[PDB]
Amino acid sequence: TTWFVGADWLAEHIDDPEIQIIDARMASPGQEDRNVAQEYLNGHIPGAVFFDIEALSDHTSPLPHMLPRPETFAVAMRELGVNQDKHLIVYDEGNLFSAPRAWWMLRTFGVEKVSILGGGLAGWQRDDLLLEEGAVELPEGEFNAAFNPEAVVKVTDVLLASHENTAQIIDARPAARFNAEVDELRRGHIPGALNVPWTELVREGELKTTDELDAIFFGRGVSYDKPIIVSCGSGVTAAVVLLALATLDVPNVKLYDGAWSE
């Protein structure tokens, strides 16, 4: 199974009404030197509305990029004019750093069909398709509160897993960050956590090949025999490991949104 779509196809459907494009680009933290929103205005796919993962996080939380309430989301999604019942196509810069997160929230919050644009934006320009400028203003889109609990685990449920190694806990952070201590656990990671740098599943704006993934996981100490939980640390890359496993058809993979009440 593949969750991506090529530019060639997206272009041949740029006008298709059952489709809607979502620009999910965003800066990596430690880069408040960027203005992702602006960039969007300066250039973006035609029809794409800005999905600001940053301004969609629960700000109440001490921890970053926390999932928002199902209603706070439904508001945002409605102003932003996104329609919960169309086939959504998500995309980011081309680094596949945040499209997975966006894709995941949209499904976690009730959108049945959601795909990611292969190669993201950079792949789009490479195919020499033009951009569109300025803010997009569509009407309010149909989108009411919905939520799929089976997508997330609690701090509690992760406590068990980690305790009796009943579920494998994966860390998407990059090696160099897995053992330092610059985020807030053992050496910065959950006890028993297996490190799987998301970057190793990415090949220019999209996931490697089934086999390439199958191998990366195997050589990282991951079996498909017990369940997998992926925790969020690098802020948002976690979703990439999720997507990569979903592509391998692994079932019930859950995202550990971080340690916060409820």
Single out the residue in 129, 147, 165 at which a domain terminates.
Answer: 147
The answer to the question of whether 220 is labelled as a binding residue is: no
Domain enclosing residue 110, as ranges: 1-147
Q: How far is CA 64 from CA 54, 177, 178, 184, 232, in A?
A: 9, 17, 18, 11, 9
CA dist 18 and 83 (Å) reads 10
Residue ending a domain, choose from 147, 173, 190: 147
In which order are the strands placed within the sheet that holds 87-91?
4-5, 114-117, 87-91, 19-23, 49-50
What is the count of structural domains for the chain?
A: 2
Q: Which of 5, 56, 47 is nearest to 26 (CA)?
A: 56
- Is there a contact between 215 and 191 (Cβ–Cβ < 8 Å)? no
Residues 121 and 203 in one domain: no
Nearest-angstrom CA–CA distance, 194 and 161: 13
Examine the fold and report which residue of 147, 177, 197 is the final residue of a domain before the chain moves on: 147
From residue 131, give the alpha-carbon distance in Å to each of 47, 77, 105, 124.
Answer: 10, 23, 25, 9
Instruction: Work out the burial of residue 75: count CB atoms within 10 Å of its CB; fewer than 13 is exposed, 13-18 middle, 19 or more buried.
Output: middle
Whole-angstrom Cα distance, residue 175 to residue 90? 27
187 close to 181: Cβ distance less than 8 angstroms: yes
Pairing of strands 87-91, 49-50: unpaired
Let me know whether 136 and 156 are in one domain. no
Angle between the N-to-C axes of helices 99-108 and 238-247, in degrees from 0 to 180, rounded to the nearest 10: 70
Positive or negative: CA dihedral 39, 41, 47, 50: positive
CB 67 within 8 A of CB 58: yes
**CA separation for the pair 255, 107 (Å, rounded):** 13
Q: Give me the active site residues, please.
A: 232
Q: CATH number for the domain including 212?
A: 3.40.250.10
Contacts of 163 (CB under 8 A, 6+ apart): none
Contact (Cβ atoms closer than 8 angstroms) between residue 260 and residue 62 = yes
Measured between its terminal Cα atoms, the distance across the chain in Å is 33
Could you tell me if 49 and 166 lie in one domain? no
Q: Please give the single-letter amino acid code of residue 167.
A: A
Distance CA 66, CA 44 (A): 26
Give the CA angle between residues 20, 22, 23 to the nearest 5°: 150
**Stated length of the chain:** 262
Q: Residue 46, Cα to own-chain centre: how many angstroms?
A: 22
What is the 3-state secondary structure of the chain?
CCCEECHHHHHCCCCCCCEEEEECCCCCCCCCCCCHHHHHHHCECCCCEECCHHHHCCCCCCCCCCCCCHHHHHHHHHHCCCCCCCEEEEECCCCCCCHHHHHHHHHHCCCCCEEEECCHHHHHHHCCCCCECCCCCCCCCCCCCCCCHHHECCHHHHHHHHHHCCCEEEECCCHHHHCCCCCCCCCCCCCCCEECCHHHHECCCCECCHHHHHHHHHCCCCCCCCCEEEECCCCCCHHHHHHHHHHCCCCCCEEECCCCCC
Phi first, then psi: what are they for 169, rounded to 5°?
-100, 120
Q: Resolution reached, in Å? A: 2.8
Strand partners, 89: 21, 115
9 and 33 in a single domain? The answer is yes
